[PDB]
Amino acid sequence: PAHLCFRSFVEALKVDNDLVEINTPIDPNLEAAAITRRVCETNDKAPLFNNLIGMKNGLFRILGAPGSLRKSSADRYGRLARHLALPPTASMREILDKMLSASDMPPIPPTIVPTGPCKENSLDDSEFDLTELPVPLIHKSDGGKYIQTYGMHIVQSPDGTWTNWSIARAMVHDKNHLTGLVIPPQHIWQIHQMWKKEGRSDVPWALAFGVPPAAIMASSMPIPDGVTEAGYVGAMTGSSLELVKCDTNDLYVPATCEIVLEGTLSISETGPEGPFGEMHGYIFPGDTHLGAKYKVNRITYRNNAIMPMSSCGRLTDETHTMIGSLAAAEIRKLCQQNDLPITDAFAPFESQVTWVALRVDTEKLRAMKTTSEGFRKRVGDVVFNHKAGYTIHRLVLVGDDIDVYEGKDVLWAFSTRCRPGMDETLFEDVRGFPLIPYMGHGNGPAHRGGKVVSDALMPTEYTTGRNWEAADFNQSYPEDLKQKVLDNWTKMGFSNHHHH
Amino acid sequence: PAHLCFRSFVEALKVDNDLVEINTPIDPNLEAAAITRRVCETNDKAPLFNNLIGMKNGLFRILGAPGSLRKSSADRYGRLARHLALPPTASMREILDKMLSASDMPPIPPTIVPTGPCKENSLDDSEFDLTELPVPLIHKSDGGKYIQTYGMHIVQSPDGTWTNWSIARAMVHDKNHLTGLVIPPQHIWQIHQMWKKEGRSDVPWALAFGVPPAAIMASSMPIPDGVTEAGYVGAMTGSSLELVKCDTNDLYVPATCEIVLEGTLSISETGPEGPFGEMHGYIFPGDTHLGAKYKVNRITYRNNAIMPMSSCGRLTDETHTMIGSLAAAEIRKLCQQNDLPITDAFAPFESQVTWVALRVDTEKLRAMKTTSEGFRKRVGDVVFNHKAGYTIHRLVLVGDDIDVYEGKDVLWAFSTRCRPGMDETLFEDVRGFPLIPYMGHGNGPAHRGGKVVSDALMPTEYTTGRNWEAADFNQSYPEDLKQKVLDNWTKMGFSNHHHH
Numbered sequence A, B: 001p002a003h004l005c006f007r008s009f010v011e012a013l014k015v016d017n018d019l020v021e022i023n024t025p026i027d028p029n030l031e032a033a034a035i036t037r038r039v040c041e042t043n044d045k046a047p048l049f050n051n052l053i054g055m056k057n058g059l060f061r062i063l064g065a066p067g068s069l070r071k072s073s074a075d076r077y078g079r080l081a082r083h084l085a086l087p088p089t090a091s092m093r094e095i096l097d098k099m100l101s102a103s104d105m106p107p108i109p110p111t112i113v114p115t116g117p118c119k120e121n122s123l124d125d126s127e128f129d130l131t132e133l134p135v136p137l138i139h140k141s142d143g144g145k146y147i148q149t150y151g152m153h154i155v156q157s158p159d160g161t162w163t164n165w166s167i168a169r170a171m172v173h174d175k176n177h178l179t180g181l182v183i184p185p186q187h188i189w190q191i192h193q194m195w196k197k198e199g200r201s202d203v204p205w206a207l208a209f210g211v212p213p214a215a216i217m218a219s220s221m222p223i224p225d226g227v228t229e230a231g232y233v234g235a236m237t238g239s240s241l242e243l244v245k246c247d248t249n250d251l252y253v254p255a256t257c258e259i260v261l262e263g264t265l266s267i268s269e270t271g272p273e274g275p276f277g278e279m280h281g282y283i284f285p286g287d288t289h290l291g292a293k294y295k296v297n298r299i300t301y302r303n304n305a306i307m308p309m310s311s312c313g314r315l316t317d318e319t320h321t322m323i324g325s326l327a328a329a330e331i332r333k334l335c336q337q338n339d340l341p342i343t344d345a346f347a348p349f350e351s352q353v354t355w356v357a358l359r360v361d362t363e364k365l366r367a368m369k370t371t372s373e374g375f376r377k378r379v380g381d382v383v384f385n386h387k388a389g390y391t392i393h394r395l396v397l398v399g400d401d402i403d404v405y406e407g408k409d410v411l412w413a414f415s416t417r418c419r420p421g422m423d424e425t426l427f428e429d430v431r432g433f434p435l436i437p438y439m440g441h442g443n444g445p446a447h448r449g450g451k452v453v454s455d456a457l458m459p460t461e462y463t464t465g466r467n468w469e470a471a472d473f474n475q476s477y478p479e480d481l482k483q484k485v486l487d488n489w490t491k492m493g494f495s496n497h498h499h500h
């Protein structure tokens, strides 16, 4: 099943005609990422590089653009839907609902099985060299070959009660180490802190690539502190994930992983990390910083292993479709659990997923007998003081008429219903997202503030009800007339397919 | 010539295949505007309604969407280019440059000719009734039949030295009066004030429809106080416009006007005006206000007269393409004349043309040795204290890499380079544009404040130079590689016409 096995997922993209197999030699030095980048910017088919120059002993093929968009609007999100056993015509609402479904279910803990495909081959300390593998250079000014753009890090709390699966970038440092970003408030960082305070040893670690697609989705999602992603994925799919034990430590990884690294995340060592062409669409050349250091002790991998790769930057790729959308889903639920009348949330791609649009049940809002300033501060306090809101710098509140999944309607509402200054509340005393250029390379503190809630609700939306009609075809003309016009459109001479 | 004669313009849209002639009966009550609205929302061909129910004695046909967009991106702006004798493939930059060209030339005053087509027919006090003409109801909740959406009002200063041509809405009040918006700081209002302070008589007035397309463009443009649009248009076209005298007053109107009303704008009377479905995409039903009152004494018109009509509201129509773009052109020049290093300006449609994006020569900016706060206040003071900035509530400053004519790149820069609050300056003590819902129906003063300058220049853009590369295909891969990828794109299996 595609959602439980990466190999089947690839086979599903083939059958969908959403794949291009490139069987001629492609250079992992920029070429593969450049092809992928172009795909992402044009919503083309996912590239499967079956012939990567320097592939040594079945390591490795590359699939690019695993969670990027399709050209048609009918199956725009079909690649994401293939992660989740959803029809390829699934709406964003449906995708996010599926990702949220597990949050009011008992986890389904994983099933330990004795072996599986990720054990078909192995290399030890003396047999692999990470500098010899065809690791991609993804952007020309990157400070390293970013092996890790679409695998999940697996770490466990010292007390064993919480095993976290998360995406965080990492690059090759030398023959048997990576460096990577490990930053608050991320769960990999929270657990890394637990181990540093215990002070006795380095963090047992695995990094799994070509994991079950439903797993990589949960990996990208800010599900709550203390919640083991394996069990959440279990509950969302309705089936216990099968895991196998690592050879060299006691962590468990999906049986069908394409590639597994086993080793340790250091509680004391660091190494040069970055720069990297990032989700907001920039790289700052030469901007290298000390990052987390990982020692790799073993590699296990499937026959004919495929490494997925996000060639991330300007729209549209996995950092937009998954980071933004999944943060927005958690934010939606968080608001609801704080008794806020939010029906829907989405991070507009046009905002480089730095905004989230929150659609409000204005019937409920009216019963609250509140004001803009009041509501804005409350919404901001809930979201910007919580980890789910880390990456989001602007919240835009909109009433019931706005479809938050439609950037054009969000932009309209923002531009026309929120008076700059007066209808906004700025937050300077919350954690900021330093990767946004205006934070980390901007004029203020990299780690603090720079957040706003912009209220695009109109005054009567708090009191008596929407008091306008839109000046559009839909709302400024009666139904019989609109039907007549639509019926006569081609007869009259105008131009007039859903799929295509 | 299309740019000097509305009839030739219509013939030019035909020949371009940018026209649909509807020769079957169409109801001016909503039907014509609904068809037009759909055209505007889908960038279809301009509708020419040759058969309007209730057309009486050659009054009148309607052309909708006269300055709206075409479907293709190659001739996106071709309808605007046909106003100006520019090729239909003209860029926005070229269109705005043409509209600005006259501002450093001597005016070419108009030529008085004894007659012309607008005199082929006439009706006096006792012969016309404005309530009987097929005046359109453009939106279902409009407070009147808006005869005037694409003609120009002609008024002259009491001292004769300044004759202003401007677009401002007006609706039928009764058999021989209109009401309309006349609001500061608009030139129709400035002149109306001159007459009110003289106090001796009502303002001699004409309202001309189906005027020379180059004239209607200048009508929409905030060219400077005291400047007679006829002479500016003369200089921009390189030819003196021919005008004929009104029968019942001493004003002059283009010889080829489709329809001319002659009469007076009252210095003392008002009447119910509005509501109207407006450029920002809304109508507030029942929101009727006292507006200017016009008495109509005579109608002259061409045989088979055509009335143009803007069915305005949500994107994209004349209120976006012309109001926004032409304000942005004047703002560009205004900045330049105040020694600000602005190269280009545009009002992003995504902002409902409430923003203007200002592209900065950052070499010049660097030589200025200034800061964000400083530059922002200066730019804001120049633009928001000037009439050219009236309709614009947010200025976004961007460096040299951004194409301000491309909404997607403006949105990117805004979202990623301007830190909310810190990188912005709010202006509460400037004139506001009350028609924006968040002004006139919002939480603050309808007429004051609500403006911001958002600085999307990055810190090093003021000091040493841009210090990033974009994480896009264009900038993160070397040229030989990009060329190779592009050359091999279809060979590999990916999808690959300018016109379509």
Ligand SMILES: Cc1cc2c3c(c1C)C(C)(C)CC=[N+]3c1c([nH]c(=O)[nH]c1=O)N2C[C@H](O)[C@H](O)[C@H](O)COP(=O)(O)O
Pocket (backbone or CB within 6 Å): A148, A149, A150, A164, A165, A166, A167, A168, A169, A170, A181, A182, A183, A185, A186, A187, A188, A219, A220, A221, A222, A223, A279, A310, A312, A318, A319, A322, A323
């Ligand atoms: C999809 C995706 C998510 C990335 C990501 C990428 C992708 C493709 C990359 C690898 C291409 C670019 C960088 N990424 C990082 C990242 N989070 C983080 O802390 N550091 C990162 O380097 N994220 C977001 C992160 O996975 C989410 O915030 C999760 O909620 C983290 O899981 P957690 O809640 O268990 O901590």
Ligand SMILES: Cc1cc2c3c(c1C)C(C)(C)CC=[N+]3c1c([nH]c(=O)[nH]c1=O)N2C[C@H](O)[C@H](O)[C@H](O)COP(=O)(O)O
Pocket (backbone or CB within 6 Å): B148, B149, B150, B164, B165, B166, B167, B168, B169, B170, B181, B182, B183, B185, B186, B187, B188, B219, B220, B221, B222, B223, B279, B310, B312, B318, B319, B322, B323
């Ligand atoms: C293209 C265009 C421009 C409208 C306009 C419309 C269109 C189609 C309408 C008619 C459909 C909707 C309303 N309009 C008004 C308007 N300006 C104004 O003061 N009142 C208006 O009612 N404008 C903008 C106005 O014409 C510009 O600001 C000019 O600069 C005014 O000329 P001026 O500088 O000589 O005063």
Ligand SMILES: [K+]
Pocket (backbone or CB within 6 Å): A165, A166, A167, A218, A219, A220, A221, A222, A223, A229
């Ligand atoms: K996660």
Ligand SMILES: [K+]
Pocket (backbone or CB within 6 Å): A417, A418, A419, A423, A455, A456, A457, A458, A459, B438, B442
């Ligand atoms: K508001």
Ligand SMILES: [K+]
Pocket (backbone or CB within 6 Å): B165, B166, B167, B218, B219, B220, B221, B222, B223, B229
């Ligand atoms: K004008």
Ligand SMILES: [K+]
Pocket (backbone or CB within 6 Å): A438, A442, B417, B418, B419, B423, B455, B456, B457, B458, B459
């Ligand atoms: K800035």
Ligand SMILES: [Mn+2]
Pocket (backbone or CB within 6 Å): A164, A165, A166, A187, A222, A223, A224, A227, A229
């Ligand atoms: Mn987690």
Ligand SMILES: [Mn+2]
Pocket (backbone or CB within 6 Å): B164, B165, B166, B187, B222, B223, B224, B227, B229
């Ligand atoms: Mn003027």
